[PDB]
Amino acid sequence: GLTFEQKAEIFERFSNSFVGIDRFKETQQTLKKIVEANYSQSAIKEELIQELKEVYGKNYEKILNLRFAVEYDGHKDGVAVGEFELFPKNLQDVNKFENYSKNGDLIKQLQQTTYISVDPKETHKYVVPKDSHFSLLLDEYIADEYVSELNDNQVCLFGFPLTCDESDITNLLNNEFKGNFTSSVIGEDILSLPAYVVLTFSSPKEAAEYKQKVNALQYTIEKRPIYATTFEDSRREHSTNRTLLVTGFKKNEYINDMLNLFSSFGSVMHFEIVEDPVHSKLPTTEQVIEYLKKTIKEGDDSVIYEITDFSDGAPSITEYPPFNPNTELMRDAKKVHEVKDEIELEKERQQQLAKRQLIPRIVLYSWDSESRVPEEYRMKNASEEQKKIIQSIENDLRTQYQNKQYLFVTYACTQQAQIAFHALNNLRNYEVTLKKSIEHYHCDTIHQTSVFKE
């Protein structure tokens, strides 16, 4: 079993304590390194490099220094370019995606947008009508399937973990497997590492007889198996038994941790996350009112558009469409039938105000500081020395984002998917299912609430 003293450590760590406070003090002191280091990575490299070696083995040197290219296809005119780093030197700069260089302004023109500022022609490329959802606009993904794509005389392998290099593969073939093959090609996955190799044999008997060799002997890198497949296994090694969902994660989590998780259980071939901003502009009431009058016709009181002003921090409301209290009234009545006519009509006029207030109202936001503020501390009354500063800040604030609490994966193997399906169901809060013909709009919630209002 275990010794006594180990239990008390396990006990204290898990005695009336939830996640966020498990070893609460130690995490504070990690900041005292980092904050004093001003987010420089200098306090942390000695610890990560041990972990990479125990996990990534040899390629840790690359994996500190890997870089993914980036392409922004949002702005209508031009596509942009950038890069993104695993484990960068600025511990602040994490999943910000700000190193883009080619087209610097066009993405700022998009982050710096209200719900009014939409020109589908010249500025913006992708737009979502009410009939549709943003997933339908995207090119619908089709994961690549390898076992279906075969010649019935070649064979593919599966299950190469992270620590194996290209040099290792070329050795094991000549050393252990000793194939009679004609050719061989390696398939690199998302990270530069390999995960599967195809082998061409001149005739099918060469393949299957070679297959049963590889699967009779159970060659096992550190703990994981490796096996071979042919056209018969295209059924089992199809995209349906590969793809998965995940939903248990929180809002604040970084991608730099996520890619390491799902790569650990096995190699990966595709990711999808939808992230939404936190801070976005809030225009003036007038710009809204100028906009609504173009969109909305008169005599449409099914819905009302509340507009609010938070330049004071407390809301002040402005409404649209405004109310028409046009009414005529009977006055100085001197007979009985004069009274009866008044009663039957005022049953409504005892109710008009409530049936106005009890209309579904679309809520909208506005700022309106420049009006209700002294002229000294305005933006128009500022200096170009300052106006650069504020635009430097606005362009920074609107780079924070929040994931939509779901995720997608394509494991190139099936056994890797079985293992991720087995562990992720048994870790913190993650919950997993296959992706059997479903799209984003099922898991989306905010879109799924607005539709119910309609």
Partner 1 sequence: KAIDPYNDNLDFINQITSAKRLIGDINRERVYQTYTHFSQKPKFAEQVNQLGEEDKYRDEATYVLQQEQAASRLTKYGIPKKYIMEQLKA
Partner 2 sequence: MKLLIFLKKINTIKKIENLNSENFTNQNYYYNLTNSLDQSEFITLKHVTFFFLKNKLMYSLSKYDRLNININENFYTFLKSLDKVDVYSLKFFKNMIFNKTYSNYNVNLF
Partner 3 sequence: XXXXXXXXXXXXXXXXXXXXXXXXXXXXXXXXXXXXXXXXXXXXXXXXXXXXXXXXXXXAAAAXXXXXXXXXXX
Q: Where on the chain is the footprint of partner 2 (CB under 8 A)?
A: 13-14, 16-22, 24, 27-28, 30-31, 34, 44, 47-48, 51-52, 55, 87, 94, 248, 250, 252-254, 256-257, 260-261, 264, 277-283, 308, 310-311, 313, 365, 367, 369, 373, 377-379, 382, 386, 389-390, 393-394, 397, 426-429
| 8 A C-beta contact, residue 161 and residue 222 | yes
316 touching partner 1, by CB under 8 A:
yes
Return the H-helix or E-strand segment holding 35. Answer: helix 24-37
Dist CA 384 CA 376 (whole Å): 15
Nearer to partner 1, 28 or 327 (CB): 327
Nearer to partner 2, 150 or 424 (CB): 424
| CA distances (Å), origin 439, targets 107, 178, 401 | 27, 44, 22
450 touching partner 1, by CB under 8 A:
no
Q: Which of 3, 4, 15, 348 binds partner 3 (CB under 8 A)?
A: 15
Q: Quick one: tokens of 285?
A: 């009431």
| CA distances (Å), origin 152, targets 241, 347, 413 | 22, 83, 19
Q: Which does 330 bind (CB under 5 to 8 A by kind): partner 1, partner 3, partner 2, none?
A: none
* Stretch of 40-48, 51-59, 102-110, 345-353 contacting partner 1, by CB under 8 A: 345-353
* Stretch of 7-15, 113-121, 222-230, 282-290 contacting partner 3, by CB under 8 A: 7-15
List all residues 6 or more positions away from 43 whose beta carbon is below 8 Å from its beta carbon: 30, 33, 34, 37
338: three-class secondary structure by DSSP = helix
* Stretch of 86-94, 109-117, 286-294, 348-356 contacting partner 1, by CB under 8 A: 348-356
19 touching partner 3, by CB under 8 A:
no
| 8 A C-beta contact, residue 275 and residue 402 | yes
Dist CA 24 CA 202 (whole Å): 62
**Number of residues located near partner 3, criterion CB under 8 A:** 10
Q: Which does 354 bind (CB under 5 to 8 A by kind): partner 1, partner 2, partner 3, none?
A: partner 1
102 touching partner 3, by CB under 8 A:
no
Dist CA 311 CA 132 (whole Å): 34
Nearer to partner 1, 171 or 371 (CB): 371
Within a 10 A sphere around the Cβ of 450, how many other Cβ atoms?
11
Q: Which of 4, 5, 11, 47 binds partner 3 (CB under 8 A)?
A: 11
| 8 A C-beta contact, residue 83 and residue 70 | yes
CB of 20 to partner 1, least distance (A): 29
Question: What sign does the dihedral 422-426-428-431 (CA atoms) show?
Answer: positive
CB of 265 to partner 3, least distance (A): 18
Dist CA 21 CA 13 (whole Å): 9
The residues of the shown chain that bind partner 1, judged by CB under 8 A, are 312-316, 323, 325, 327, 350-361
